[PDB]
Amino acid sequence: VNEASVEHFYSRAGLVGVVEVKDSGTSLDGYTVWPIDVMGFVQQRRKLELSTYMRFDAEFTFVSNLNNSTTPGMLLQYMYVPPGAPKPDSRKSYQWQTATNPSVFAKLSDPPPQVSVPFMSPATAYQWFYDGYPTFNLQYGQCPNNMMGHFAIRTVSESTTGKNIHVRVYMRIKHVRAWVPRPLRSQAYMVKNYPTYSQTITNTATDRASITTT
Amino acid sequence: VNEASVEHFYSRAGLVGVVEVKDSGTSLDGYTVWPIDVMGFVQQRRKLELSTYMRFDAEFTFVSNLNNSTTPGMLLQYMYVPPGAPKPDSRKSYQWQTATNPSVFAKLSDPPPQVSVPFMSPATAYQWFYDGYPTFNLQYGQCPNNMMGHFAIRTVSESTTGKNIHVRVYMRIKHVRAWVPRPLRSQAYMVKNYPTYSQTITNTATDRASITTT
Amino acid sequence: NIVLSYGEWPEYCPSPTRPDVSVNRFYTLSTKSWKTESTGWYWKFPDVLNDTGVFGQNAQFHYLYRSGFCMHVQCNASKFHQGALLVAAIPEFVIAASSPGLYPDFAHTNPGKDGQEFRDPYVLDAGIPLSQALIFPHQWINLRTNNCATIIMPYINALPFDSALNHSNFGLVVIPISPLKYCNGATTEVPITLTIAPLNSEFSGLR
Amino acid sequence: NIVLSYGEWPEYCPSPTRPDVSVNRFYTLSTKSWKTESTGWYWKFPDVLNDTGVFGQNAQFHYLYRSGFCMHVQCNASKFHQGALLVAAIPEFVIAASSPGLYPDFAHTNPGKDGQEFRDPYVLDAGIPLSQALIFPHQWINLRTNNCATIIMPYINALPFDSALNHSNFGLVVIPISPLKYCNGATTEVPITLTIAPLNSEFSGLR
Amino acid sequence: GFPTELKPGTNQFLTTDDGTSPPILPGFEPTPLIHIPGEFTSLLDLCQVETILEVNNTTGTTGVSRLLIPVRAQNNVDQLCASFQVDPGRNGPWQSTMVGQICRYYTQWSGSLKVTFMFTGSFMATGKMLIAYTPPGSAQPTTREAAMLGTHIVWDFGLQSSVTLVIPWISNTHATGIVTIWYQTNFVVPPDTPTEANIIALGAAQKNFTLKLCKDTDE
Amino acid sequence: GFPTELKPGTNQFLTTDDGTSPPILPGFEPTPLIHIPGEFTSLLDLCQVETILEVNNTTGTTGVSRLLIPVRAQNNVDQLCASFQVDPGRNGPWQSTMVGQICRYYTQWSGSLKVTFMFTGSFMATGKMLIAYTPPGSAQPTTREAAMLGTHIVWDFGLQSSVTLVIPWISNTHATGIVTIWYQTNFVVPPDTPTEANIIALGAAQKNFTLKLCKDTDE
Amino acid sequence: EAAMLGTHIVWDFGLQSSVTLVIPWISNTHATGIV
């Protein structure tokens, strides 16, 4: 009790996306945009598709470093492009200054930056399964009201720095409420955003020799 | 409600000026003065010229670094030259020691320095539009009572250091009160401090084919 | 003996046209033939009535729609027939395709008033395992005991009102678990009849 | 039926000479000719009276000044004329020049008691769009309904008192939206008359 | 409170943070606050003020003419006069309205709009106009009779110079309503009177209008 | 509280920590929370719902047939019908159950299980089946008579279509119970009636079931 | 199916041996109902 509660079942902030600010070699960009997708890894998607409707707010945390695990004093900007705003296109973009895009300036040689994001959706709850069509075959069953906005990251810098910076985005689902429990997935996940499966059905249980064999 | 309030409409501290302390190459100065101008960028000027009279106090923040985004232990002095005092002329100026000029000594390898500035004006409120002449053609419509004083920045140093230091000044308008709403600008901004526009008027709305076309 | 989906009678949204018993009548759909090798059938809830009668008119001419339902299955077998059906109501029944051609055809996502026979009854055509479909509201049709099953399902959606044609709320599924076996000399195809009756229906935005 | 600019009757600054009805009389300015192609006119408020009568004397000889105003427009058209004027009062009317010579000439920033005809009525000669000028206090002069419009505008400035000659408080604008059309054989130029009457006026610092 | 631990989230400069900062000039007493008439404290209060709709936005029409719906005499009855969508924040007529401009500073908006029309012809000129409004589902009605079976107002501009049309609801969550004006009757005038007037449309937002999620604009 | 000392444990990012963080979008009022029917707030409440047990998991049997215990006529009496362990969380029949799947998301579990059987033959078909249950200590009874001296239920599927078997306790701390179904009598039918039925087994967990120490799964 | 949207009775003769159908009105003044 209180240990299998639905709140405790989704706690314990875990990795959701490993994005990499490329700035060296053949990728002299210096920025990268990572669209927020809770259903990133399968181990998380299967837990989320347990319920149909879900309402929560997240607490993102960024664990960044260089590739040799050092953390020099480089200065980073993390900008949260809200759902419905334009996303930047290069290192120097007018979008990097729109005061309606919240931004967090934190050096590498600092504790990880942490920011909460509220429940951002027009509906009453996020909806993993949408039996319907928007725009009243590659459009079926895809709800647009689950978008949580983007996260753009750039080094506050003039030219290229020649240092790749790996970033690890961690997320903590707070205040979880869920509705309409569903059967847990049984087949492999063939494709993102679609429940398609393989022609070769795999039994849910492992097959023994006889019905009278233990 | 409470989301389109006039206070929330001007919150969310945003960039107002990117000044650069040049100290290398052909610019062995080591200091730079940035006169405070809220109406720096157009995206901010258009929001401010919505109202005619405005009263507030700002909370400036300085996000400084070198050009490779590093932040060594260099020591900086930020001095606020109040409205009506003389501004320095070089690295070593008697003005750098006038105890009536508040100053903030903070290294680069420290959190950004933050200072509030109170409502500094002889009038009751800042006035973006001044239909009149001071000094009772290049003097019309220019109120002098909007000056908020200067911000001078120098590296506390003996000789030149050979390191350009870019500084990003962020400002947060607190306690905003506004009067006499005005129509939002319709034409391009041709020139700073003047509402002059181009001979080629651009329609406020986009032109369709016919009045019976959607 | 009627199952109450999640235990909430359907209710009008408190404050839009509220129809009457002229619309809230019993629509008796066609009867499908439960044969031995038959795999099952499913209907999308609001989609099954979008082209029949006054309810079809209201759905195809208004903009917002919300209604409960009192789906009702009955099957008339003899006393010498044997078998067992599972009828459940699945909210947000998202049919998925089966790649070895990556998304289901419209004839499989909105079958209409005629229903569609399952292609993969084990995995419910949606990857989830049948052995767990009982987590939804359901009733067992076991020929030796009962031959009817009524499910009252209220309105389950994120928004208060939604389009009656673009987004189908839930799906009624009926699958034979224990296949139909019968000795020689009986009616070789038990008939299954599905009666629907909307409840506390509402529309808004006519024409 | 008189509009109250921002809903505040003009009031004396509580504690300077307070003039009397000898000054607080109705100054009737000249009448301008509203023709078909005419674009409109504007007057700077305190500037329009700085050279006429006792008020002109008080303004041109004292140092500080504050006063309200009861601007009043009327136009005497026939019943067969058609048209529509927009009259509004714009605080801090900062006229701007129109570069293709970068600042407006003094004859355009302080026209005097004769008014100035607009060069760009669409953009109010100030970049702002006419379609929004209604955000200011205004009244519609539509010939089929009414032919008068009164605006009571109190004293709006940052400082308590100001110079009557250096800084003009606001500007009265009157623009034809729907142009004046009339069949053949009528008075081809409707006359527009502007009556002004200061209210709760004050001065200080004589000679 | 003597022993303390620096939890994660230190030294971060969060731009949208409401922290405190030391005053740079203590003791400095700013200028006292005297009363100024005309204070506004909510952009919604601005949105609710009727402004003109640039309805005649067509290629060629310039200047103030872009704010006039022409109404001419030899328009055979049951012909269509004017039409425009109801979307304060899509590139169209509503850009010229106060609410149309403010909503571009926000992301989401939902509420009920009103559109006031005003006839500006000769007093002697009589006639009748039919204003219909089609909800966002359907498409524009093609004939006057088809529009007659909808939320419409018959408008006898001979008797009333100005009417008002309320729009029930227009939400922006992710297909918008349309308003059409139909020549109900002909245009009747006694002799020696102009035979071409103008209708002026004024847009606004009712008291139930709301905004959310401010953002930058697109000029 | 002005002087402070940074005790050890600073700057550590503890993933499973319940710290606080500044809201990124202050003032933003999220969509109000309307009522939705069908809220679940404890996985145990899900565990308690009876679901089908993939009892016939044998090499070759595919499709829905894997959920059926066949019961045939020419089965001489006192022969064994079916058997399966009681271990919701070991690779076996219980994988197909809701509780079987949830317990793989936890480490420890202890409580009492119930298993409901259901006969799906002709109405006219009568007979008798013996369901025994052997505690985790012993081994599977080899003959019906040996099982008869245990916690068993005689089940006359001619009279009752479905019975229920409670399991006293099954704990996971570090050897599990077994359930066997025996042909008590023959399979008796009147003429012209199928002579092969199916028994369906439904598993669940009673109210005293508990879990602990959530962890990742093994698909 | 077309008749199903009318005044009808579903009759499960397995359960009920006999049902009754009332006809609302049939007048002879000067085109008759059908069952």
Are A186 and C127 inside 8 Å of each other by CB? yes
Angle at the Cα of C189 from the Cα atoms of C187 and C193, rounded to 5 degrees = 115
Residue C46 contacts residue C113 (beta carbons within 8 Å): no
Taking the CB of residue D131, how many other CB atoms lie within 10 A of it?
28
CA distance B80 to chain E (A): 8
Task: Report the candidate in G6, G15, G11, G1 with the shortest Cα–Cα distance to residue G35.
Answer: G6
Task: Report the candidate in A147, A95, A60, B170 with the shortest Cα–Cα distance to residue E16.
Answer: B170
**Can you read off the two tokens belonging to residue E83?**
């039409």
Q: Where are the beta strands (DSSP E) in D105-147?
A: 116-117, 138-142
d(CA F152, CA F173): 26
Q: Are strands E162-166 and F170-171 parallel, antiparallel or unpaired?
A: unpaired
Are F38 and C156 inside 8 Å of each other by CB? yes
**CA A203 → CA C13, C85, C97, F93, F105, distances in Å?**
44, 21, 18, 11, 19
Using the Cβ of F101 and the Cβ atoms of chain C, whether some distance falls under 8 Å is answered with yes
Taking only residues 171 to 210 of chain B, the set having a beta carbon closer than 8 angstroms to any beta carbon of chain D reads 179-187, 190-191, 194-199, 201, 204
**CA E121 → CA D21, E186, E194, E198, F177, distances in Å?**
41, 14, 8, 7, 96
Residue C198 contacts residue C68 (beta carbons within 8 Å): yes
Closest chain C CA to residue A192? C102
Cβ-based contacts of C69 with chain F (< 8 Å): none
Cβ-based contacts of A113 with chain E (< 8 Å): 9, 12
Using the Cβ of B199 and the Cβ atoms of chain E, whether some distance falls under 8 Å is answered with no
Identify from A61, A64, A76, A100 which residue to disrupt to test chain E contact, counting E C-beta atoms within 10 A and taking the largest count: A100
User: Which amino acid makes up residue C159?
Assistant: L
Are C100 and A194 inside 8 Å of each other by CB? no
d(CA E199, CA B214): 19
Q: How was this structure determined?
A: cryo-EM
**Can you read off the two tokens belonging to residue G9?**
């009775």
Using the Cβ of A145 and the Cβ atoms of chain E, whether some distance falls under 8 Å is answered with yes
Radius of gyration over every alpha carbon of chain D, rounded to an integer in angstroms: 17
Cβ-based contacts of E177 with chain C (< 8 Å): none
Task: Report the candidate in E179, E123, E117, E124 with the shortest Cα–Cα distance to residue E150.
Answer: E179
Cβ-based contacts of E173 with chain F (< 8 Å): none
d(CA A8, CA A13): 11
Structure's resolution in angstroms: 3.3
DSSP symbol at A6: H
Are G4 and C76 inside 8 Å of each other by CB? no
Using the Cβ of E194 and the Cβ atoms of chain D, whether some distance falls under 8 Å is answered with yes
DSSP symbol at A88: P
Are A104 and E13 inside 8 Å of each other by CB? yes
User: Which amino acid makes up residue C200?
Assistant: N
Q: Which of C121, C130, C135 sits opposite F46 (nearest CB)?
A: C135
Q: Which of E4, E9, E213 sits opposite F5 (nearest CB)?
A: E4
**Can you read off the two tokens belonging to residue D60?**
């041109």
**Can you read off the two tokens belonging to residue C127?**
């990857």
Using the Cβ of C188 and the Cβ atoms of chain G, whether some distance falls under 8 Å is answered with no
Q: Which of G10, G12, G14 sits opposite C28 (nearest CB)?
A: G10
E71: left (phi over 0), alpha (psi -120 to 50) or beta: beta
Chain B residues near any Cβ of chain A (below 8 Å): 12-15, 41, 43-44, 63, 65, 67-72, 109, 112, 166, 168
**Can you read off the two tokens belonging to residue F215?**
């962890």
Chains in contact with D, counting 3 or more C-beta pairs less than 8 Å apart as contact: B, E
Residue A176 contacts residue A182 (beta carbons within 8 Å): no
D193 burial type by CB count under 10 A (0-12 exposed, 13-18 middle, 19+ buried) = middle
Chains in contact with A, counting 3 or more C-beta pairs less than 8 Å apart as contact: B, C, E, F
Using the Cβ of G9 and the Cβ atoms of chain C, whether some distance falls under 8 Å is answered with no
DSSP symbol at F46: H
Q: Where are the beta strands (DSSP E) in chain F?
A: 5-6, 51-52, 69-72, 80-85, 108-111, 113-119, 126-134, 151-155, 162-166, 170-171, 178-188, 196-205, 210-212
Q: Are strands A126-127 and A150-155 parallel, antiparallel or unpaired?
A: unpaired
Residues 6+ apart with CB under 8 A from E198: D84, D178, E68, E69, E70, E71, E120, E121
Cβ-based contacts of E150 with chain C (< 8 Å): 207
Cβ-based contacts of E135 with chain C (< 8 Å): 63, 205, 207
Residue C5 contacts residue C151 (beta carbons within 8 Å): yes
Closest chain E CA to residue F21? E9
Are D92 and B191 inside 8 Å of each other by CB? no
Q: Which of A97, A156, A159 sits opposite B65 (nearest CB)?
A: A156
Identify from A61, A78, A114 which residue to disrupt to test chain E contact, counting E C-beta atoms within 10 A and taking the largest count: A114
Chains in contact with F, counting 3 or more C-beta pairs less than 8 Å apart as contact: A, B, C, E
A101 burial type by CB count under 10 A (0-12 exposed, 13-18 middle, 19+ buried) = buried
Q: Which of F39, F82, F93 sits opposite A212 (nearest CB)?
A: F82
Taking only residues 16 to 35 of chain G, the set having a beta carbon closer than 8 angstroms to any beta carbon of chain C reads none
d(CA C144, CA C80): 9
Taking the CB of residue C126, how many other CB atoms lie within 10 A of it?
25
Q: Which of A4, A201, A204 sits opposite F42 (nearest CB)?
A: A4
**CA B119 → CA B44, B87, E29, E42, distances in Å?**
19, 20, 9, 22
State whether residue G8 is helix, strand or coil.
coil
Residue C87 contacts residue C177 (beta carbons within 8 Å): no
Task: Report the candidate in C142, C145, C148 with the shortest Cα–Cα distance to residue C193.
Answer: C148
Residue by residue, what is the 3-state secondary structure of chain C?
CCEEHHHCCCCCCCCCECCCCCCCCCEECCCEEECCCCCCEEEECHHHHCCCHHHHHHHHHCCEEEEEEEEEEEECCCCCCEEEEEEEEEECCCCCCEECCCCCCHHHHCCCCCCEECCCCCCCCCCCCHHHHHHCCEEEEECCCCCEEEEEECCCCCCCCECCCCECCEEEEEEEEEEEECCCCCCCCEEEEEEECEEEEEEECCC
Q: Which of E32, E57, E83 sits opposite B203 (nearest CB)?
A: E57
Q: Are strands F113-119 and E69-72 parallel, antiparallel or unpaired?
A: unpaired
Burial D97-124 (b: 16+ CB within 10 A, else e): bbeeeebbeeebbbbebebbebebbbbb
d(CA F177, CA F168): 10
Cβ-based contacts of E101 with chain B (< 8 Å): 184
Using the Cβ of F204 and the Cβ atoms of chain C, whether some distance falls under 8 Å is answered with no
Angle at the Cα of C86 from the Cα atoms of C82 and C87, rounded to 5 degrees = 130
d(CA D33, CA D38): 8
Cβ-based contacts of E110 with chain A (< 8 Å): none
Task: Give, for E110, the enclosing helix (H) or strand (E).
Answer: strand E108-111
State phi, psi for F178 to the nearest 5 degrees.
-135, 145
Give G7's Cβ-side CA count (13 Å radius): 8
d(CA C11, CA C14): 9
CA distance C192 to chain G (A): 13
Closest chain F CA to residue E11? F11
Residues 6+ apart with CB under 8 A from G2: none
DSSP string, A31-47: EEEEE--S--SHHHHHH
Task: Give, for E198, the enclosing helix (H) or strand (E).
Answer: strand E196-205
